[PDB]
């Protein structure tokens, strides 16, 4: 039944938490609700697909040019994380 490995599952969980904290920080700075910056669904997708570029984040459902620019800090988190830990990035099907 499971398609992903145990290690991939843990990586997604760990990265997701870092994205939640980065979203909170950036939303607090912009004085906006966290969900206005990115919904939980967007964050789940970002933890799974791991976009590291602006062009790649835009391929995620619900991420426009404007949101992509707002998500720059989180793209930095994903690239830092996936470097320190040795995991695959930019996992897109199409």
Alpha helices in 31-57 (DSSP H): 34-37, 40-49, 54-57
Least gap, CB of 81 to Cl ion (angstroms): 11
Return d(Cα 41, Cα 31) in angstroms, integer. Answer: 21
CB of 21 to Cl ion, least distance (A): 9
DSSP 73: H
3-class secondary structure, 28: helix
Query: Which stretches of the chain bind Cl ion, using CB under 5 A?
Result: 17
Identify which of residues 21 and 76 has a Cβ nearer to Cl ion in the complex: 21
Give 17 or 62: the residue with its C-beta nearer to Cl ion. 17
Least distance to Cl ion, CB of residue 14, Å: 5
Q: How far is residue 10's CA from residue 30's CA, in Å, rounded to a whole number?
A: 30
Q: Nearest-CB residue to Cl ion?
A: 17
Looking at the Cβ atoms of 39 and 53, the one nearer to Cl ion is: 39
């Amino acid at each position: 039944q499971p398609v992903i490995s145990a290690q991939e599952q843990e990586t997604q969980i760990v990265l997701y938490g870092k994205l939640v904290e980065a979203r909170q920080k950036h939303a607090n700075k912009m004085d906006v609700p966290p969900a206005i910056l990115a919904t939980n669904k967007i964050l789940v997708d970002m933890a799974k697909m791991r976009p590291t570029t602006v062009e790649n984040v835009k391929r995620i459902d619900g991420v426009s040019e404007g949101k992509a620019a707002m998500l720059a800090p989180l793209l930095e988190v994903i690239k830092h994380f996936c470097q320190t830990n040795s995991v695959q990035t930019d996992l897109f099907s199409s």
